[PDB]
């Protein structure tokens, strides 16, 4: 979700570069696919999926 963007790049370029930044995933074998979670239908942070940055 972009609130303000006033650079020379565009929104999809920045989102595309953010998608490729590797995050350390050692609790990902114990996390759950977000289509399989009962909670977290609020487009935000959760505890078995959906870490927020």
């Amino acid at each position: 979700e972009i609130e303000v963007n006033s650079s020379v790049l565009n929104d999809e370029f920045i989102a595309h570069r953010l998608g490729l930044i590797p995050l350390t995933s050692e609790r990902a074998m114990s996390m759950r696919f977000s289509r399989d979670c009962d909670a977290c239908d609020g487009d935000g942070q959760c505890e078995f999926c959906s870490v927020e940055f």
């Binding site: 565009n10 929104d11 999809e12 595309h16 490729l20």
Partner: protein, 1008 residues
């Protein structure tokens, strides 16, 4: 140093590279457009207006005294013309005017012309405001970008070049006409001021574009064919009528007797047919008039110029008309000699000693750029303005009323509307017949690449005359060598008529500062003032097709003229032509030849003795190491094919070319291995596929409001290098990405010229494009006629879909405009909608909203949508070698064949494409780039191990097979180009070795 070795090939090839990059530093690539427009503004604009003194005879009446011819015959004449820089003429402190204002406001980037007219009508021949007329508005002329009038040129780099109207890729040889970007195409004309020898009626010809009273001499017409007559020379139609025999026009010009007129012609002697022809000429001459008796017995037969003419050439039809033949000649004793020279040329052409004039040999052709075309159009509309003015002066006979001489009669809108319709409609004036129109002139300017603009600014065009044996008008003629391009051309309706100016080509402009007296200092005895016959077999020196003298031992004379030119003592745009067989010297100071520079093989070679680290091009033209050479002069020069080994095998060369890849066009010279492909494939790549590839767009996208701007994300340069791409240093000449290509059979999805990509590579950003489209509308001023008011608003009564529009009538700047919405709310106050709506296939995020206007309030609206596209399963791609396809199958990563390093291809193509289409250049390119990008083992000791690496795939000078294969042996891979893979499904060894390696591919527009 006379051996010219010991300063050998790594020095000379380095000098050629430095000279070529200094060439493009000084001249650029739009040099000829700018030079011709600048020359028009500096000289030719004032040169047009000097026409006459504007007499006025006012023929209305003569019954009575108070309407006699007693009101004064007026007089008025033009003086200086002054042209402003273009300003935006608003009241309350007028403003400076820029081309981006003209594009975004839909007006014409034009400047005002002011003329210093003088009028001194004064009553003294009946039976004044020269002052207060300094600045009279006379039309508005448009202005080329980067001209001597455009406001984007006075500051060099970082004073204020950043204005609000710039790109870093733009060089600007275009116009802006009511919001659109126009561009001239170079025309092609015959070289007049030269004798022209036909052969169907044998009619040797003295043309003149000006002075439309000029003649031809025709020998192959007998007037009858009953039994047979001898061929006699009749000096046929002379004043658009009035045939005369040749001998009446001899003794009218004062030849004393015969046997000097035979020595004025001075043919071979013998060859009976010639002397039979001339005695038949005399016998025809005395049959129509008894000539050579008085000063008026022969000159009185020149009589058809009076009444039997249909068009009497002015008043005083007598010896005053003798300055309508040969105005460059000054007295009759030279005009008689030049008539004898014409007849000698005709007789020499009859006996098969002089070949007739081949039209498609480009030394007989002058190219008309923007200067001459503006000359022609402005002369037409100015002549109409003069007639319209003098008809307006006559309505005020014998009563003044409104007499202020200026600003009541001289209407600027005439020339304004004329020059506007010339650019906007394409109704361009024909160069010969001053009533019709021609069309294949000024076009639109492409912007899809920054290479399409370069190709669109460098073009020359042969017209269509009549389709009955055009001859060789669409086939490369050996005079194109080094000047035009013999590989790339369009195909279709105009295949070979539109030609591409080469890299090192240049166009001469004009030579002022007259050079008749400059030739005396090397030879050049002056022409006599009597027939007599003292003229030996000495050579002849013409100047733009004009006898101005006669010299002898011309082998030294032209050597001294070239030596004065190389020491910067004669002007640089002057061709020196020594015809040794016809015994003739031609000197050209002409406007519109084709010039290119060459290495002069000096006998001292200053490069060894001096060696600075800089070479400006003005500096290298002073020492005479380089030299601007035309087409005429070059055929007397034996030029080598490069310093490589070829200027070192002999010393029988007088020049050298810089490098052979500069023979090609701007878009063909950068193709790797370009002399290996079939010619049809290179035509494809260098005319259509380079002009369509998706890549760079601009470096200020906030101002370009045009339909369908497109752009990649990550543009690249190729792994290899060519000569021209290195000397130019524009990485915007390459629009695509370095894909890895493996040739192998896939499951049947890459058949019939179809290609297979990799989904993982597509998901990391590869070939991902981004398009921007603009939607436009308009409404009147504010309230005036100068209801049907369709003022931009909301109209809240829910006509269509208004979820995103604001109160002003336009959406906001983060919207997500859908498949079919309302994009501009152009609705009236009470009636139905006139609002613009999206159609079925346009959608996207709003990028900006631009709202401008015109002088009469015509408010303009601009909305740009943005989209991001990844390449789908229907899109088209191509290599650098005319090898195109359609993406037919997008494959997941773990099913491709992988090498022992784990490398996967990005594009897989079918091996049935190569043995038929004859492009081994793609395989050689893949092997070269694979040998570049790999590391190099055994680097410990004995070398730095990265210095004997070939990166140059220059077209006509290319690396050998042994170089490439020994490089692949040094890099560790197999010498045959192949590579062993394992399968991505069964996992075991595929039996056939696979050819892999990187290749520069391209993505083309018109996606589906």
């Amino acid at each position: 140093e006379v051996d010219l070795r010991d300063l050998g090939e790594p020095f000379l090839q380095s000098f050629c590279k430095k000279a070529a990059t200094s060439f493009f530093d000084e001249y650029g690539l739009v040099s000829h457009q700018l030079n011709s427009y600048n020359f028009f503004i500096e000289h030719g604009l004032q040169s047009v207006f000097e026409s006459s003194g504007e007499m006025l005879v006012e023929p209305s009446f003569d019954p009575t005294k108070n309407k006699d011819h007693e009101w004064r015959y007026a007089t008025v004449k033009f003086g200086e013309v002054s042209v402003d820089k273009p300003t935006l003429y608003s009241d309350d402190k007028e403003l400076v005017f820029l081309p981006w204002h003209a594009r975004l406001q839909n007006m014409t980037y034009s400047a005002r012309m002011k003329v210093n007219v003088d009028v001194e009508v004064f009553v003294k021949k009946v039976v004044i405001l020269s002052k207060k007329t300094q600045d009279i508005p006379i039309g508005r002329i448009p202005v080329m970008v980067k001209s001597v009038l455009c406001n984007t040129t006075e500051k060099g780099k970082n004073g204020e070049s950043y204005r609000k109207g710039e790109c870093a890729f733009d060089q600007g040889g275009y116009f802006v006409i009511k919001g659109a970007e126009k561009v001239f195409i170079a025309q092609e004309q015959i070289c007049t001021k030269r004798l022209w020898i036909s052969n169907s009626p044998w009619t040797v010809s003295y043309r003149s574009e000006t002075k439309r009273n000029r003649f031809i001499v025709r020998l192959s017409e007998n007037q009858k064919a009953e039994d047979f007559k001898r061929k006699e020379k009749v000096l046929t139609v002379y004043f658009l009528s009035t045939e005369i025999p040749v001998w009446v026009l001899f003794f009218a010009l004062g030849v004393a007797s015969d046997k000097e007129a035979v020595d004025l012609i001075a043919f071979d002697g013998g060859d009976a047919s010639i002397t039979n022809s001339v005695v038949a000429s005399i016998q025809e001459a005395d049959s129509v008039c008894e000539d050579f008796r008085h000063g008026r017995n022969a000159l009185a037969y020149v009589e058809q110029q009076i009444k039997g003419t249909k068009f009497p050439p002015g008043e005083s039809v007598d010896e005053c008309l003798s300055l309508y033949l040969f105005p460059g000649l000054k007295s009759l004793t030279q005009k008689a000699r030049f008539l004898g020279y014409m007849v000698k040329c005709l007789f020499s052409a009859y006996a098969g000693k002089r070949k007739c004039e081949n039209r498609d040999n480009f030394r007989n052709k002058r190219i008309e750029l923007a200067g001459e075309l503006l000359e022609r159009e402005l002369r037409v509309h100015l002549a109409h303005a003069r007639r319209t003015m003098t008809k307006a002066m006559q309505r005020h006979l014998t009563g003044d009323g409104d007499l202020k001489p200026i600003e009541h009669y001289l209407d600027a809108s005439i020339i304004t509307n004329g020059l506007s319709r010339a650019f906007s409609t394409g109704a361009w004036c024909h160069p010969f017949r001053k009533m019709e129109r021609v069309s294949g002139v000024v076009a639109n300017l492409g912007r899809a690449n920054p290479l399409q603009s370069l190709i669109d600014l460098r073009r020359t065009r042969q017209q269509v005359l009549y389709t009955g044996r055009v001859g060789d008008a669409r086939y490369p003629h050996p005079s194109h060598w080094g000047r035009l391009c013999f590989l790339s051309t369009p195909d279709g309706e105009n295949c070979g008529l539109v030609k591409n100016l080469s890299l090192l080509g240049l166009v001469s402009t004009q030579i002022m500062e007259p050079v008749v007296e400059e030739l005396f200092d090397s030879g050049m005895e002056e022409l006599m003032d009597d027939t007599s016959t003292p003229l030996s077999g000495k050579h002849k020196v013409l100047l733009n097709g004009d006898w101005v003298g006669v010299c002898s031992d011309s082998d030294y004379f032209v050597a001294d003229l070239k030596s004065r030119r190389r020491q910067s003592e004669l002007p640089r745009q002057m061709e020196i032509k020594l015809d040794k067989d016809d015994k003739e010297v031609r000197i050209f100071t002409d406007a519109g030849r084709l010039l290119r520079p060459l290495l002069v093989v000096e006998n001292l070679h200053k490069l060894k003795q001096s060696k600075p680290s800089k070479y400006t091009f003005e500096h290298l033209l002073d020492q005479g190491i380089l030299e601007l050479i035309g087409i005429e002069e070059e055929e007397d020069c034996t030029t080598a094919w490069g310093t490589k080994q070829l200027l070192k095998q002999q010393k029988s060369y007088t020049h050298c070319e810089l490098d052979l890849s500069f023979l090609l066009g701007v878009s063909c010279a950068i193709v790797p291995f370009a002399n290996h492909d079939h010619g049809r494939r290179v035509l494809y790549q260098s005319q259509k596929h380079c002009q369509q590839a998706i890549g760079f767009c601009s470096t200020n996208p906030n101002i370009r409001c045009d339909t369908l701007s497109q752009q990649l994300f990550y543009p690249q340069r190729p792994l290899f290098k060519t000569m021209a791409s290195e000397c130019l240093q524009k990485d915007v000449l390459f629009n695509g990405q370095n894909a890895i290509v493996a040739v192998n059979v896939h499951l049947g999805f890459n058949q019939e010229d179809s290609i297979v990509m990799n989904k993982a590579s597509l998901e990391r950003g590869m070939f991902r494009s981004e398009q921007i489209r603009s939607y436009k509308a308009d409404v009147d001023s504010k309230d005036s006629e100068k209801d049907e008011v369709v003022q931009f608003g909301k109209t809240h009564s829910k006509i269509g879909r208004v979820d995103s529009l604001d109160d002003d009538g336009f959406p906001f700047v983060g919207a997500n405009m859908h498949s079919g919405d309302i994009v501009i709310g152009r609705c009236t106050e009470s009636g139905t909608d006139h609002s613009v709506k999206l159609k079925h296939t346009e959608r996207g995020i709003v990028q900006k909203v631009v709202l401008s206007s015109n002088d009469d309030g015509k408010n303009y609206a601009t909305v740009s949508l943005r989209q991001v596209r990844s390449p789908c399963l229907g899109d088209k791609f191509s290599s650098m070698h005319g090898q195109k396809g359609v993406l037919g199958y997008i494959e997941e990563q773990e099913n491709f064949a992988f090498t022992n390093q784990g490398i996967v291809p990005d594009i897989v193509i079918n091996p049935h494409a190569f043995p038929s289409r004859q492009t081994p250049g793609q395989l050689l390119e893949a092997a070269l780039s694979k040998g570049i990008a790999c590391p190099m083992q055994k680097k410990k000791g004995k070398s730095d191990a990265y210095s004997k690496v070939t990166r140059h795939a220059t077209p006509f000078s290319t690396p050998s097979v042994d170089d490439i294969t020994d490089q692949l042996h040094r890099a560790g891979f197999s010498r045959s180009g192949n590579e062993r893979v394992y399968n991505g499904r069964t996992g075991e060894m595929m039996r056939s070795l696979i050819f892999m390696g990187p290749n520069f591919y391209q993505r083309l527009i018109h996606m589906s």
